[PDB]
């Protein structure tokens, strides 16, 4: 084998998946114009692993084990690259992971909001296009976010509601409520790939999924060359991959506001799992399937709990701070979302574990040297925001 | 006064909006690219209705009244222009009409769609930072659509819905469905602007309106040059006034489908008041508000029988064809929504009248011999859409 196009698949989720994907015996191919790369030179950020160029770690792949995945490297909002890109590959499934994803990044500057709008909703509308014109019984898995649906004072399904309005019932999309421009741009993806799912037969399955942590995977751990990245600054990295190097090198965990933001989680190794598994099932045509993706719900304190405890058992006395929040977004609020779907098609999930944050925090510790720790606290607020085009 | 910017001015809304405002009192401004008439040039289309250009019509209301309302060309997709415009000017109000409004444009090729998407919402979003970085408490009266909620089986409410689900309450914002990619790029806009409100304190009107009828309002009649465009070919012509030319000149009523499709329209005289009302009585800061703007609801059914009713008396023998509908929408559909806000802040609405009709019958049929019949049927299909860009 089955043929599947890896849009994003320099990034972490896409690499990670890539290689998953390829060890599975699909016949894979990555479609990345590297700007990722391209912003931590611009803002002067660095993953805390070392990590290979994408040509080198493809040779690796293909050294270990004798697979090819094969390389495009374009802008998918350049229509003409991505039509040559899926003529020359012809993919059977496509997996969206290629977009700015950053919530603060999108919140830096005027032009940083527009960009992560253009980019984003543009290259996915491509997308829809290609699949539409070059192979229209191609699955789409597209990553979304359970950002798009904020935080209601009611239990969040998986993209549909029933409800009874006025002695009316009906099945409809759940109401969103995005809490930054990137968020917002997911939120404006899923509208439009529903539309072509009801126009044009397209299938699709959106995997909104939850907060990911950790950096190993099978694959990514047979030779250096192939590791994935790890984000620690306030722009790119998450809560609990920055609570985890920031523990190791000393600096109090940066609680925001109240620290009672809940939202769910997922360790890397479930991200490619639950790919797989919605490849392997895919939706039927003109299907628009929603799948919440994550396995377990933390607050950033309960996070913030868990973090201390494992580092104390490795001599390293964790703290904590509060850090006026630079977000503009609920520090209290009610939260229950259902994530049953993935579940009965067979995940199988790797629940966050004493083992797996012993095995996180070590390896901070061993490129504790790395860590630029002037990159740790946030810089961009959300509601600060300007319209000059900022320097960092 | 009070200063009121109006985005998109040269139109058939904003048009009729700012001479109705400049009457009232307000300084005026339009803000226009006057790409819309690029459009007509480039498709082959013509107004029934001979129009002036944006500068004699603005040299003849000051020639009329003694009122100069300003102008500045340009699109407000570039910055520097929008900003510059507002810094210039300085406006209380700004009411956002510039946005490419057709269904069936936004569908005819890849580059159309994508066009649709980036110029709406990338216009829109410069709007909001303009009014956050130059005039904060400015309000944004936002042409929305009533097109947002789709067809669902339940009342249609105006943007919000207080849902118990789960045993738990609260009110969200009401659950979008729209079906194309112009209907779809005003979903995206009302949820950004809906963020910004909360984030960083936006007054917002977004006014989701009906389908609009008409070419006369007192402003617009005084003068031939003053005169508005009445648009009657399948890409930017709507039902009743399609209907109304159709019967002028001897052509069947183009009823697409089984014509059970049911629709909000208003008077364009009830448009020009609306927004009046808007922003006279002004959102608060952070709130934002929908209205549902429109006066009755009829299907496409109903407004070929008014039509042939009122063309009788004129002697014009109506007849009706079923058209094979170019788009993916329900024929036979549950609806009622919600239109009340405007009514109880004032609105005195011109329902649909034998006078209007025969007025309108009988414009069109003074102007009969400048409609080009072959750009009544529709061409553009909403599944066929394909990726080369079409020459019409
Ligand atoms: N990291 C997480 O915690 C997390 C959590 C939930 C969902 N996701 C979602 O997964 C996806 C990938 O996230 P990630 O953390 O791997 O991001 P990443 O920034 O590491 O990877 C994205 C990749 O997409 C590429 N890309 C961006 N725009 C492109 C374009 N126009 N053309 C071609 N390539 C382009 C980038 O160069 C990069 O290699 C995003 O949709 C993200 O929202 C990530
Ligand atoms: N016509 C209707 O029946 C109807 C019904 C409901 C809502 N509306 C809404 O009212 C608004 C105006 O509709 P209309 O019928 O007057 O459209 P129109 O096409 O007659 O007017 C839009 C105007 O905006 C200008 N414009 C477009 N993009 C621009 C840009 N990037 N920069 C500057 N100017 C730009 C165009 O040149 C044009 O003069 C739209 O939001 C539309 O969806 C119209
Ligand atoms: O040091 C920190 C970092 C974050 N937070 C809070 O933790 C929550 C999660 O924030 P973060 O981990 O930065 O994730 P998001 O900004 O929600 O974004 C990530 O997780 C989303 C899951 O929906 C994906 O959509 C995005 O692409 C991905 O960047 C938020 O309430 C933050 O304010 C803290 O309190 N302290
Ligand atoms: O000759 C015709 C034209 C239209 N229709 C149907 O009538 C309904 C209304 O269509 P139309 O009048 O073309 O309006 P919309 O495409 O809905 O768009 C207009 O009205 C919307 C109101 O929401 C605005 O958002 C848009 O900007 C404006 O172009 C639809 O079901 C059409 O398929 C027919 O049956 N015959």
Redesign the pocket.
């Known amino acids: 084998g089955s043929r599947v196009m890896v849009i994003g698949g320099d990034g972490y989720c896409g690499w990670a998946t890539a290689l998953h994907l390829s060890k599975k015996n699909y016949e894979v191919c990555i479609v990345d114009n590297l700007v990722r790369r391209l912003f931590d030179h611009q803002l002067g950020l660095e993953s805390l692993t070392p990590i290979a160029s994408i040509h080198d770690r493809i040779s690796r792949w293909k050294a270990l084990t004798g697979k090819s995945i094969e390389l495009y490297v374009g802008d998918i909002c350049d229509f003409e690259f991505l039509a040559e890109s899926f003529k020359s590959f012809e993919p059977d499934s496509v997996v969206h992971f290629g977009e700015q994803?950053?919530?603060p990044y999108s919140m830096i500057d005027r032009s940083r909001a527009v960009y992560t709008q253009h980019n984003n909703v543009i290259g996915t509308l491509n997308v829809l296009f290609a699949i539409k014109e070059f192979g229209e019984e191609c699955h789409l898995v597209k990553l979304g976010?359970?950002?798009e649906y904020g935080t209601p004072n009611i239990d969040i399904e998986e993209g549909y509601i029933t409800i009874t309005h006025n002695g009316r019932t009906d099945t409809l999309p759940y109401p969103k409520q995005a809490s930054?421009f990137?968020?917002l741009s997911?939120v404006h993806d899923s509208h439009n790939i529903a539309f072509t799912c009801k126009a044009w037969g397209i299938r699709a399955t959106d995997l909104n999924?939850?907060?990911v942590y950790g950096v190993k995977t099978d694959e990514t751990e047979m030779h250096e060359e192939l590791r994935n990245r790890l984000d620690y600054d306030?722009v790119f990295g998450?809560?609990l991959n920055?609570?985890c190097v920031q523990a190791a090198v000393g600096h109090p965990l940066?609680?925001?506001?109240k620290?009672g933001?809940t939202?769910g989680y997922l360790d890397i190794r479930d991200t490619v799992q639950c790919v797989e598994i919605a490849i392997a099932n895919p939706a039927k045509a003109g299907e628009f399937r929603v799948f919440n993706q994550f396995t377990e719900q933390f607050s950033?304190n309960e996070l913030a709990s868990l973090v201390t405890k494992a580092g104390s058992k490795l001599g390293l006395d964790v703290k904590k701070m509060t850090v006026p929040?630079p977000?503009v977004?609920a520090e209290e609020h009610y939260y229950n979302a259902k994530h049953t779907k993935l579940m009965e098609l067979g995940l199988e999930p790797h629940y966050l574990s004493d083992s797996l944050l012993d095995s996180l925090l070590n390896f901070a510790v061993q490129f504790k040297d790395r860590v630029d720790t002037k990159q740790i606290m946030p810089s961009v607020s959300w509601k600060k925001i300007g319209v000059k085009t900022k320097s960092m």
């Open positions: 994803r950053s919530a976010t359970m950002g930054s990137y968020h997911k999924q939850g907060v306030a998450t809560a920055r609570f940066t609680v925001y506001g620290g933001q939202r950033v929040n977000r977004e």
